[PDB]
Paper text:
Copper-containing nitrite reductases (CuNiRs) catalyse the one-electron reduction of nitrite to nitric oxide: NO2−+2H++e− ↔ NO+H2O, a step in the microbial ATP-generating respiratory dentrification pathway. CuNiRs are trimeric and each monomer has two characteristic β-sandwich cupredoxin domains that contain a T1Cu centre with (Cys–Met–His2) ligation. The active site is a T2Cu with (His3–H2O) ligation, which is situated at the interface between two adjacent monomers in a cleft ~12 Å from the protein surface. Electrons produced during denitrification are donated to the T1Cu site by a partner redox protein and subsequently transferred via a 12.6-Å His–Cys bridge to the T2Cu centre in a proton-gated reaction.
Here we show that substitution of a surface residue (F306C) at the entrance of the channel of CuNiR results in an altered second sphere coordination of the active site Cu. Comparison of the crystallographic structures of the ‘as isolated’ (1.7 Å resolution) and substrate bound (1.75 Å resolution), allowed us to assess the effect of this substitution on the substrate access channel and its associated water network. Access to the active site from bulk solvent was also improved, as illustrated by the ability of nitrite to diffuse into the T2Cu active site in the crystal despite polyethylene glycol molecule (PEG) (present as a component of the crystallization medium) being bound across the mouth of the substrate channel. Previously, we have shown that the T2 site is not accessible to nitrite in crystals of wild-type AxNiR where PEG effectively blocks the channel. The binding of nitrite to the T2Cu results in Met135 adopting largely an ‘open’ conformation across the substrate access channel, suggesting a communication linkage between the substrate-bound T2Cu and the distant Met135. In fact, this change has been observed in the wild-type AxNiR enzyme and several other CuNiRs upon nitrite binding but its significance had remained unnoticed. The effects of surface residue substitution, F306, described here produce sufficient flexibility to allow increased solvent/substrate access, illustrated by the presence of a second water molecule (W2) in the active site pocket and also improved access to nitrite since binding is not prevented by PEG bound at the channel’s entrance. However, the substitution of F306 resulted in an approximately fourfold increase in specific activity and had a marked effect on the apparent KM for nitrite, which with a value of 1.2±0.1 mM is some 50-fold weaker than for wild-type AxNiR. The apparent affinity for nitrite obtained from the laser flash-photolysis data (Ks=0.8±0.1 mM) is in the same range as the apparent KM value obtained from the steady-state activity (KM=1.2±0.1 mM).
Residue numbers in the entry:
A (entry chain A), B (entry chain A), C (entry chain A): 2 to 336
Write the structure that this text describes.
Amino acid sequence: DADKLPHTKVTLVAPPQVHPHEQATKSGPKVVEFTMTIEEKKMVIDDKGTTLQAMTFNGSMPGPTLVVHEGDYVQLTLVNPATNAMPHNVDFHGATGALGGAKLTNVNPGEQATLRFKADRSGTFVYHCAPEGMVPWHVVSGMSGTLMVLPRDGLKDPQGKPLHYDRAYTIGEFDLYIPKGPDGKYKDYATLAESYGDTVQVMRTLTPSHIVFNGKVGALTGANALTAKVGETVLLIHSQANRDTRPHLIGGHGDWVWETGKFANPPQRDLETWFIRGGSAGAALYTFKQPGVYAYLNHNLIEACELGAAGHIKVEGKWNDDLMKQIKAPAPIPR
Amino acid sequence: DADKLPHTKVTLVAPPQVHPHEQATKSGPKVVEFTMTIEEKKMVIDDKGTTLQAMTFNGSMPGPTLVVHEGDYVQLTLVNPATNAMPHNVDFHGATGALGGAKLTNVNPGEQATLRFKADRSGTFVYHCAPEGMVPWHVVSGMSGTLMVLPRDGLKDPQGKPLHYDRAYTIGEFDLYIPKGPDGKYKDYATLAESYGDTVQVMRTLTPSHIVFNGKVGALTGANALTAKVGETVLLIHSQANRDTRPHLIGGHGDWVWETGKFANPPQRDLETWFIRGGSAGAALYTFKQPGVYAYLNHNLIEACELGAAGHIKVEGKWNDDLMKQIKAPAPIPR
Amino acid sequence: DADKLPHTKVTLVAPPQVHPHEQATKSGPKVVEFTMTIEEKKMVIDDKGTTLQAMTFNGSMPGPTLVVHEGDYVQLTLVNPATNAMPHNVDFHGATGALGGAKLTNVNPGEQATLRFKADRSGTFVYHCAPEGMVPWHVVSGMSGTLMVLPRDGLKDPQGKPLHYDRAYTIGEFDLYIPKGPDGKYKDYATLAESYGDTVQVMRTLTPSHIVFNGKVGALTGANALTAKVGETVLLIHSQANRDTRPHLIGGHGDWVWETGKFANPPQRDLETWFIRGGSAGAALYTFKQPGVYAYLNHNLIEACELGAAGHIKVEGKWNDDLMKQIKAPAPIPR
Ligand SMILES: O=N[O-]
Ligand SMILES: O=N[O-]
Ligand SMILES: O=N[O-]
Ligand SMILES: [Cu+2]
Ligand SMILES: [Cu+2]
Ligand SMILES: [Cu+2]
Ligand SMILES: [Cu+2]
Ligand SMILES: [Cu+2]
Ligand SMILES: [Cu+2]
Ligand SMILES: [Zn+2]
Ligand SMILES: [Zn+2]
Ligand SMILES: [Zn+2]
Ligand SMILES: [Zn+2]
Ligand SMILES: [Zn+2]
Ligand SMILES: [Zn+2]
Ligand SMILES: [Zn+2]
Ligand SMILES: [Zn+2]
Ligand SMILES: [Zn+2]
Ligand SMILES: [Zn+2]
Ligand SMILES: [Zn+2]
Ligand SMILES: [Zn+2]
Ligand SMILES: [Zn+2]
Ligand SMILES: [Zn+2]
Ligand SMILES: [Zn+2]
Ligand SMILES: [Zn+2]
Ligand SMILES: [Zn+2]
Ligand SMILES: [Zn+2]
């Protein structure tokens, strides 16, 4: 019985961080309490000033990542402030019943609700808004994130051997559908509701205008690059709630990857590129062996390099000449 | 030798049902006899009256599902009535040789042919029409279905433990390419042959106008929803003969999934969303734990919700508060 | 230490062949030396005379396949002749560090460089050009190929049993983005640099104009069909450096397939259709059981049959009536 159990309250953090948590744990099941507040807002999504009439959990794209253990109960208070215009709810793919919790969390502006469900299945799972009759629009406008349910005894390799990460990052990839006017410039809308009709028309073409990590072209670059150091193992959580993507770490690999994102299945090793089905979250472990600036991108290189689906990881440490060595630098072709 | 074996005749049923059959079986190999009759016809595919000049096996999209066991021989009589206009044939992906049987089953209107092949490989396999020089058109116009070849000892989990379904449903997902006229309205054609040229032009854009389960937007909804009850295990066969899709059961999971559809491989568990490669059939088992109306859809939510790739499953039984509970219903945000 | 090891020089061959090599080997690690020379050139890519301002490794699309064993070191001399116009480099997905070697191999026309890296991970891996700020264009214009790193003890099935191929073929699949002028005809450009701007615009639509194996519609057909005979096992290496594809052998199967392409993972068996993520190379084994002309294609049948992603394999040997038999040839429907 769930009412029997100890409760615990978690404080969420903004992507690309993930809130402090234990992997393998000696603790027994808890009721883990979270709160998220919906925020609609206009966001600038590229370096040319294009804006999106966006919708978010907790003010970020993606929403924050929620972490529990298998056998825990997730208890979410979802708040829809009166400063928003639309009704919202939440569908946890990690949950069983009631359209993922959507039927039990319909919240008009000025309302809130509390849902509990048992996290009985391990993996990274998408959660997203799913209001009746306007599902894709809320999703593509930014309302998704990841619930990670860790096995109580931590991650395992195909032979049952223990795996771990030293640091976790969460990347949400968003296919955006920004309309254009007769002058071929992207439209800027005064309200969310005004964007709707034109946006549906772009959606129906199936061609995103932009595809971005974490809300903006260049979100995970420069000062906001991810960081690591040689010897450290990183977990890269990648969610795409609406469209397929193909993550790749340039100069690296997926050492162990659950591309379907479900930790009771054996991971695959040595991946160059993996696949996140639209409507899922996946997870890759990599232990850094070389220092330098890596790119982490969607390996449809048009989607990455023209449309925005690419970030950076800056990795400290000592170069390893056994792994790779410039034998002869660029120099004239001798004749 | 195949001429040695007992024959048996199977009566096919219309999707989304699958004809009566045994899973694990003590019977030895049989020659399993089927017949299908091709039917070209105009079909209404959406709620706005749009029509498709369609082509079908047995009058339905998809064609009916054929079920045998590994080691059986499939023996198909394919009939192309003189009331049709085009030549047809059939390519079984479950078969070895002769372009899947296409080279041996070329049938002009008024002809028929009988093919036999050995079902030596277990899984769900696409079959489709493949007339020389007009393959994609026949496929996208509706000519595909699934052959399911069960292992003689039934389905197995990754550890070799037995799995079963209590009920099987078959869903064919069809990317349709319906042309539009200068007024932006979909074209209605008096004959199949008249649709061809304009349809090729839409196909070459790679953008479907509609994407539908089982022939029509809303095919598997309302009175035609799929049904189950709590405690029952269902097999959801999903075929897509031309384009990738990503099945998802909202409020449920794929308990055991063979997304590539081949039962000698271990299934994956706990999937939120799986992937059916264009040109394949996949299969998922789920045991219902909560009652209610579920959506089964392609989790590109534009393809599902705007373009049509979505159906419903109405599930009887008792709600389970341990799995999920509304702790606090939607209600004003206290201040 | 790598400087300790014996060196060996490999002579490359043009696709669809793969250079002579050993699978399981008693030899210890070597430094394997290769050379490739970049060639920019206009190529005719279809039967209607359309041209592409192409970029290639070694004059072919794809580049040639390089084969080593796990634990070897690849040592590549990359040469960019002064007759080319653009700078180039190379990113080996099989390598660790420095953006796959791209940062250490930047070569302007008239220069060359030599890179070494350790092939410490088994599988087929894409390599491609990745010049800063123009990555997708170089890739989609033809600059990719496969590095195959075999396990030292050869390929293995899921139970550790030995697998082999008798013959290997390499297929690169290229999504091309050829611009059109106001008359709706494809543009022919006098130089590579002149194609750039218009090509970017087509790329951003995400809709290829052509999708081809090995550089041209029909590249692997007629006199250039692949060949096999009944009883022979073939390895079909399939690379796609930019876009997803779904290989299928019509009338055959993937007997053992590593669709993610990484040989330390167990292969899947009996596949009808497999999936190569954009940015990866995959590998399938098939042992031929029937003679005849097979099609090997991308099973989005529009991409294959309208856009070009399809070739042929002509297989010698004796027909097998147990596997498949025409019981009754096409003939009038009796009444
Ligand atoms: O690995 N280059 O995208
Ligand atoms: O799980 N919602 O599509
Ligand atoms: O298997 N026919 O494409
Ligand atoms: Cu919402
Ligand atoms: Cu969902
Ligand atoms: Cu047909
Ligand atoms: Cu086929
Ligand atoms: Cu280049
Ligand atoms: Cu790459
Ligand atoms: Zn309690
Ligand atoms: Zn916990
Ligand atoms: Zn809508
Ligand atoms: Zn560590
Ligand atoms: Zn880029
Ligand atoms: Zn960058
Ligand atoms: Zn007989
Ligand atoms: Zn049987
Ligand atoms: Zn055609
Ligand atoms: Zn049962
Ligand atoms: Zn929907
Ligand atoms: Zn519905
Ligand atoms: Zn040396
Ligand atoms: Zn070697
Ligand atoms: Zn560019
Ligand atoms: Zn052999
Ligand atoms: Zn074709
Ligand atoms: Zn052909």
